[PDB]
Amino acid sequence: GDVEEAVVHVADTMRSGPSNSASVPALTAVETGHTSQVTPSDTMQTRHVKNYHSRSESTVENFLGRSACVYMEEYKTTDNDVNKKFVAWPINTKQMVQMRRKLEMFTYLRFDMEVTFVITSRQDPGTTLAQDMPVLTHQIMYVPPGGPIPAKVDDYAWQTSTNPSIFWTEGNAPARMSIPFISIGNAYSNFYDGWSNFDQRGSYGYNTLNNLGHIYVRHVSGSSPHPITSTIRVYFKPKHTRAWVPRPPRLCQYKKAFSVDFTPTPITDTRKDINTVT
Amino acid sequence: GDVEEAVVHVADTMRSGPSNSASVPALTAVETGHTSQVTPSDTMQTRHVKNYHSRSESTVENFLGRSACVYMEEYKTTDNDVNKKFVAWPINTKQMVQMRRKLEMFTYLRFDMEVTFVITSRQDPGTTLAQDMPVLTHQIMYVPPGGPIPAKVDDYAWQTSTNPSIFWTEGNAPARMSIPFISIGNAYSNFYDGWSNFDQRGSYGYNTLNNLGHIYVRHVSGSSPHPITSTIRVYFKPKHTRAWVPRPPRLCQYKKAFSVDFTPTPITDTRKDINTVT
Amino acid sequence: GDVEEAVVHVADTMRSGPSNSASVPALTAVETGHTSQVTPSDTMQTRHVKNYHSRSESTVENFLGRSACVYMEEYKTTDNDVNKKFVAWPINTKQMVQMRRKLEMFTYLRFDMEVTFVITSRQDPGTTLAQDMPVLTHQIMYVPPGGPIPAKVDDYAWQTSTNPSIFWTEGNAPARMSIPFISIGNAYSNFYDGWSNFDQRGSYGYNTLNNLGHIYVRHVSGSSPHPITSTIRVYFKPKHTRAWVPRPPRLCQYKKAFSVDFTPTPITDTRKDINTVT
Amino acid sequence: SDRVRSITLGNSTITTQECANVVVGYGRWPTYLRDDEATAEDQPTQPDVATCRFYTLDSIKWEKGSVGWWWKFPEALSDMGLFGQNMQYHYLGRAGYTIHVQCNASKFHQGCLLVVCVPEAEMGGAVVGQAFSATAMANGDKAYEFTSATQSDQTKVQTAIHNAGMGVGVGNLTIYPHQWINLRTNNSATIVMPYINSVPMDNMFRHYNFTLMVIPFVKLDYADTASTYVPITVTVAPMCAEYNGLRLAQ
Amino acid sequence: GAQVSTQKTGAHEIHYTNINYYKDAASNSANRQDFTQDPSKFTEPVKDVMIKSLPAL
Amino acid sequence: GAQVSTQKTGAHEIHYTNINYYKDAASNSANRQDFTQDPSKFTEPVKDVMIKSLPAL
Amino acid sequence: GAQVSTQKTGAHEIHYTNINYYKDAASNSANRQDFTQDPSKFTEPVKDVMIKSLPAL
Amino acid sequence: LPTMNTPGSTQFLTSDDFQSPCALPQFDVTPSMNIPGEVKNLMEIAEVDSVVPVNNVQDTTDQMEMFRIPVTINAPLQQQVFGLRLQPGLDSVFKHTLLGEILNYYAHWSGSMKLTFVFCGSAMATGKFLIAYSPPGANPPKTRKDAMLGTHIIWDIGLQSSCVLCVPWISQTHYRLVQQDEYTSAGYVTCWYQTGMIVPPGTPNSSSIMCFASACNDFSVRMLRDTPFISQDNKL
Amino acid sequence: LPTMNTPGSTQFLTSDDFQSPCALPQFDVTPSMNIPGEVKNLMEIAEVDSVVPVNNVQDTTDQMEMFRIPVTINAPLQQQVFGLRLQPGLDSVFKHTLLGEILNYYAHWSGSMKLTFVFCGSAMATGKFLIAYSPPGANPPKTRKDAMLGTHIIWDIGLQSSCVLCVPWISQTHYRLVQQDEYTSAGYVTCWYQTGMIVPPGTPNSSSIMCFASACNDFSVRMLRDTPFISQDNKL
Amino acid sequence: LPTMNTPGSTQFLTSDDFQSPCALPQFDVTPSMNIPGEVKNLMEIAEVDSVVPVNNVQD
Ligand SMILES: CN1CCN(Cc2ccc(NCc3ccc(F)cc3F)cc2)CC1
Numbered sequence A, B, C: 001g002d003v004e005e006a007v008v009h010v011a012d013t014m015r016s017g018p019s020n021s022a023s024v025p026a027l028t029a030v031e032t033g034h035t036s037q038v039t040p041s042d043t044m045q046t047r048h049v050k051n052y053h054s055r056s057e058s059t060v061e062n063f064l065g066r067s068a069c070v071y072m073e074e075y076k077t078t079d080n081d082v083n084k085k086f087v088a089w090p091i092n093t094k095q096m097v098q099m100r101r102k103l104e105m106f107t108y109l110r111f112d113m114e115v116t117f118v119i120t121s122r123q124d125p126g127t128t129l130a131q132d133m134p135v136l137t138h139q140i141m142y143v144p145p146g147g148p149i150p151a152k153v154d155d156y157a158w159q160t161s162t163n164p165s166i167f168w169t170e171g172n173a174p175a176r177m178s179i180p181f182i183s184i185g186n187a188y189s190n191f192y193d194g195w196s197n198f199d200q201r202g203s204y205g206y207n208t209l210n211n212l213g214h215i216y217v218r219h220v221s222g223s224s225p226h227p228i229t230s231t232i233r234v235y236f237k238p239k240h241t242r243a244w245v246p247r248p249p250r251l252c253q254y255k256k257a258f259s260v261d262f263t264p265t266p267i268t269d270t271r272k273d274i275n276t277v278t
Numbered sequence D: 001s002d003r004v005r006s007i008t009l010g011n012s013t014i015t016t017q018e019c020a021n022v023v024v025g026y027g028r029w030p031t032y033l034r035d036d037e038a039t040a041e042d043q044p045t046q047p048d049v050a051t052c053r054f055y056t057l058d059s060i061k062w063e064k065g066s067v068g069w070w071w072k073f074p075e076a077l078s079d080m081g082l083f084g085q086n087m088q089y090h091y092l093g094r095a096g097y098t099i100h101v102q103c104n105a106s107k108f109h110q111g112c113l114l115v116v117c118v119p120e121a122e123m124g125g126a127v128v129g130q131a132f133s134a135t136a137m138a139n140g141d142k143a144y145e146f147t148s149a150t151q152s153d154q155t156k157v158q159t160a161i162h163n164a165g166m167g168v169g170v171g172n173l174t175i176y177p178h179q180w181i182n183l184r185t186n187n188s189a190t191i192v193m194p195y196i197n198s199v200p201m202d203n204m205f206r207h208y209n210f211t212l213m214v215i216p217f218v219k220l221d222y223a224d225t226a227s228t229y230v231p232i233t234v235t236v237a238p239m240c241a242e243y244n245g246l247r248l249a250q
Numbered sequence E, F, G: 001g002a003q004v005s006t007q008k009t010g011a012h013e014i015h016y017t018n019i020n021y022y023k024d025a026a027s028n029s030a031n032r033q034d035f036t037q038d039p040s041k042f043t044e045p046v047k048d049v050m051i052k053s054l055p056a057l
Numbered sequence H, I: 001l002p003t004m005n006t007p008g009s010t011q012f013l014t015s016d017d018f019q020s021p022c023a024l025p026q027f028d029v030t031p032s033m034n035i036p037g038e039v040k041n042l043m044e045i046a047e048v049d050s051v052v053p054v055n056n057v058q059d060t061t062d063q064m065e066m067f068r069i070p071v072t073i074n075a076p077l078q079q080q081v082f083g084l085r086l087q088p089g090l091d092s093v094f095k096h097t098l099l100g101e102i103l104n105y106y107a108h109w110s111g112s113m114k115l116t117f118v119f120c121g122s123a124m125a126t127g128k129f130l131i132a133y134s135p136p137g138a139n140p141p142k143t144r145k146d147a148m149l150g151t152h153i154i155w156d157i158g159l160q161s162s163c164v165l166c167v168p169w170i171s172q173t174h175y176r177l178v179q180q181d182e183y184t185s186a187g188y189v190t191c192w193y194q195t196g197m198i199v200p201p202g203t204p205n206s207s208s209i210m211c212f213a214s215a216c217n218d219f220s221v222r223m224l225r226d227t228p229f230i231s232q233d234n235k236l
Numbered sequence J: 001l002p003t004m005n006t007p008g009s010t011q012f013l014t015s016d017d018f019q020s021p022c023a024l025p026q027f028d029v030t031p032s033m034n035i036p037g038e039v040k041n042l043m044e045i046a047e048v049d050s051v052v053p054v055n056n057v058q059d
């Protein structure tokens, strides 16, 4: 057991000749809700062709297997406002438009997650900038629902004993981690046509099922004589994906981060007349 | 021998039908100090259900297998006070609240330790900050009990010949090391209801058994024209854990780092009346 | 199956002696378009020689298997002109002369590509330069044809959800990636003697087949108090190469990046007379 | 002939003498919950026959200016026979459905309807960033009207037909299970919808399993006849329904 | 305990080794080598199979 | 001298290799794959076993 | 699943191991060990073979 | 040996598993000893009974009163004894119990629960009680007739002084959030007089009942989080 | 163990496949359940029919009119019913269809296409139509005589109310660009009256036709790109 | 796993041979076709005749 060993082309085209019979493949009835299965070989003479094309790149695994930004935020190393020196982001996947659209083509999903963090820093403009500061360090902390939440940069809550955390230093490769399928159902749900209270009242929509927790970031101990601003970008990359119940892609522009609200939009563009082809 | 090879779901629910007999599973007697072992199948009709849930995440190994801050301190590269240019921390695990609580759920513990150090630096505010300084280097030294203790940054004791030490440079990954079960008993003890002297006098409590040594940190040779402040955080991560004699979790807030002293606290919160459920 | 196992010298010279016969290897007729195949052994006496020379270094795989710059551009971290803070390069391999010439010796090519990016930064000259800025970070984004194109550094399009991207930090090794044979034909074409419209009108030349997409680069969040300029160089390195239909190397200097236009050039240099050999 | 279909559930029967085949969800027939997939411990209740039968909801009137209608399930059957009582008295429920939509007209009428069941048909408010009560989207068995023009009342859902009140192209609803009622060659559409959800069971008062939509793509037309409208009727029948978690009536 | 397997390559005209280092299956790399598919679920959801040659009704 | 073993994964619907590089057992990675457990120590500490069906006294 | 093979070296007077880590064949290293060649395509494109010793015409 | 660093290098993840060098090579550890009472899973703790402070009347001058449910003689017919929400990790009643403490270290939970009631009256006293569990709904029960519809058990007081009500796991999802909300409600538990308490001459006119909470053998938790009950402002 | 880092170390490539540590060791995932309707390839979606808005007349006050092609009685002989370019990913007609949306996420496409037409007139109405596909050329057809030269099918309206025109894959290259240009044109599709529509007394004088678009079983796409239809200016 | 970086790490050598990640995973390449005139070594070109401009008379 030092080793252990472990492709699907599209359909070919078969030669067809002249025909004259009672069979009518072309004629059908869409009223049944059944899409036809005719092929070009059934309506005109065709030669024999061997197709080596493959549909590898259209698998859901590959379609969703690309990292995408889902959130970015800024925090300063030193400032008067306490709330401005750290970030607190409730986790959700509906704030950036492209990744949201991509996900919203399926009603239910089940996958592992790969998270990557990109952090950059810059010196704020000012009258006096001459200073020398060693390399900075950052802390990322994940707080499952119901856990304590810090209220300031130097709060006791930053002494994580059970909450996973990452300490990262500038100049190295971006931080990364993997998370398993952390849901309470048998699959994640992009849509939820229901209410919170059993009396059909309360919050309505997917917001109701969003209880993934929070993420907090801060400078470990950096406190410069002059302000320094940092930005963090979060990237998600699904793995081992399964999807169910496809739905039509969205057409109207997004307008709210926790709702389906929209404005009516034309079906498509227009042209001069039904015959114009130029 | 190039290779060598090497799961437990919760109990299922069995179908149960109507019953009428002299057996009375519901009735018991808690006076025996024996918790019941009834199941829902013993009091109402139930269907057959196969449970694939597992208790993997609740093992003591996983419960305690998370790094947590246990101490943080600051020291300056250059200053007038000699004592302010280095750190001297007697090792103990009772200074940060969360990790302390987590550990205090068991009377005795036995585990290996994984220690990680996070170090960051920042330039102190001042009138003149224009300077150029190469990357800094830090030294961490561990002094078992009874060894010599340095009295200043440039003391001879920093020439460790038997004391393990780590030299680290900013911009790289955090330092790390592993330590074995270094106790004098067959297990560590979070609590000790006894005295030091055989006459029932002297120190009382776990302090008595705390003889793990000290940790010292300093800048190797950095001495800037202007002060630079650095902070160090210490993280502990038990491995290969075994625990004995569980005890109820603490309820009152901690108030001393080497004592169990506390202030009386209400059992829990209150509500309008015994029937209020809203 | 823990392992699995897996050279061609030039022709030798055979000894030849005096000859006197009706065979005339020297005489031939180039009118047939057939190059001779005579050898020195066929016209003068020769000794036996064993040649250990090999033509390994002249294979097309090795000839083209060298990375070469194909494009360089500059962008500033902060400036008044929005278009000057990022790069937008339509991909093509006809802008740098040497690599263009090398490729243009074959009509058709088919290979994998290895892309490497070299990024450097420098502080722009000015009256006041005293500042402190952490390490910078850069983003490279690839936009296949027809995708959305950003219009400013902080556009929404930079939240790639399907477009591959690379985040890189200064001080580390250059970024790299590999791309497969991404063409719509069975091979890439350096030349195309045809038009775009079926009426023999429109664009003419290889430009017509250039639809590889775009590349965009920007500073992630760096925004310095004073301008900082960065330069990016792109290197391509074909792999697994196959070539067809060789053509004579170009003689006239290149003058346009999307055309074969040129100016007439002398065949070669001159000398005093047909007999001069000094 | 395959143009005749007969369906018998419980003590009710449906006979259509001119119809197309029956579509079956995503190729899955309704079925009971398996032992290895359940989560609740107690014994379920399976009142077949009493609850698995056809229930004809009220009827609508198809005019030349109609735009469409929708119903939401299972709330539509909230007060229909023993099904409603069982749903009221239980915390959890689970059931598939068989939807049959009838519409008949002479040979001289023309028109086309789209019948489609949309699972998790979440809808947006008429005015962005404004909540609405649980009355502008489901009020029992009564049907709701789509609107040709953009909605404006904040108390109601956006009824713009071409967006389907979901922000998606109306022409793309074909992806869901569906059928067409073309007056030339059809009189009814039959759809068998299995139980689709992210959990084995769910409360039927808090969650709308799926939405039924009827949209006239080709408006009704006729000339010189005494009939002024074409009635449309909808019939539903739960299949393999089982409840759990008995408690006090809601 | 290494796995060997083929890698995408062309057609007319090739093995890589993989080893898992972590004890959680979520850490494995993406398994993007599966290409099985079946569209009959959405294209032919009818109850009675219909032959293309025969009339629909 | 490599160890191969299964990794956590789902249920209804998978091997990693490990090698030790250091000469001290304390350097090994956490052995968080053990799931054996027995609660009778704290729930049934009585001397005489009691049958649930039978009366307690 | 490792491949062993010879490496260029001198003449009169030697094995390297390779393993593939990625699931796409495009990631492999350059296969610059092939030395087969045939110039007759461009040097002798005639229809009737001509013997060098015999006269061309 | 050519190599390329992937993203995530040089990161410090607090929940990683990697080998690291030992700082005390060839250290001889003390021999192991089998101390009584080894624990190998927090669920073992979670299945032990603990007293539930049900009497949170906002007027408890004496703290110990929280653990005793009053009962009277000559009680109106069919009266409510107590009522509470079934939120083991969030409700004040179960917040600090031995079970509640364990859950607060996690985010998801599932399985059944056991509620045990013990009558601590006199030996001559007698009575019957109805204990019912009502799954989630629009309104909690208000009268015994409403309560008796749901899962319930009729408790008779005799030689056996304890009765166990097993709360079945009825839920639409495999798991429930510890920080429960409207979506993942769990229902209510109430107790009512079935017959009333009768006493002979020369006995106290009032008695008390106590409640014990524990988890069944199918209980489990998931996702570890840091508890919110304990906090500090300054280094000790 | 000596080593040397090759170029590309410490880079973050958004489409890489590497193992990384798990932040929640020994996490127990919820058991899987076979929900109906699993999808394993976007082509499965791409092969489903969808209505094509062919009637883009720049004067559509009512949006729903875009899906209905007018037809009249007493029509001039051999008149054109409609015409359009075959650019499934670029032309406004196919831009937003269920098929067009999928292609816009890719750069290359190949394979055949299906166009299905359904007559939604009266039962007593009758007629014949000619539908032709013209490969790329210098000029699109202007009269039925020109159209009938290329691939076409004569459609007869009867009991079967639907007819399918299969557009064959005729191209000089194995693939075509989604952002089509002159070089990779695909041709035109047009429909003409073959005989005309005849109706008896007491029937409407106008009827409508609808078109459905879908991909055959040899269709495929390649190279993933980000779609251009959706954009934002500020964080939501 | 202890390791030590040797000199040359993090260098970019334009004539190196290393594996690198693919930016388009599971991409389906177009089928190959045998176009006439494949060339596999520049010597094949070098052995073809060509006219030599011998008359370089500066005039
Ligand atoms: C409303 N649903 C929300 C979840 N969304 C899928 C999803 C689920 C979880 C996550 N991330 C979970 C997570 C994992 C690890 C962390 F550190 C923090 C986190 F929030 C991302 C996307 C589908 C739509």
Ligand SMILES: CN1CCN(Cc2ccc(NCc3ccc(F)cc3F)cc2)CC1
Binding pocket: B091, B092, B093, B113, B115, B142, B179, B182, B188, B189, B190, B206, B209, B210, B212, B213, B236
């Ligand atoms: C009172 N007991 C003190 C020990 N505590 C467990 C414990 C024991 C040793 C350690 N660390 C030992 C150590 C190991 C390596 C060092 F470099 C320095 C050290 F102090 C940490 C926690 C349980 C309570």
Ligand SMILES: CN1CCN(Cc2ccc(NCc3ccc(F)cc3F)cc2)CC1
Binding pocket: C091, C092, C093, C113, C115, C142, C179, C182, C188, C189, C190, C206, C209, C210, C212, C213, C236
């Ligand atoms: C006119 N032809 C253009 C293509 N050229 C060969 C070629 C093809 C593609 C590429 N690069 C494709 C590519 C690959 C990956 C990217 F991120 C961006 C890209 F543009 C480079 C050279 C031969 C001449």
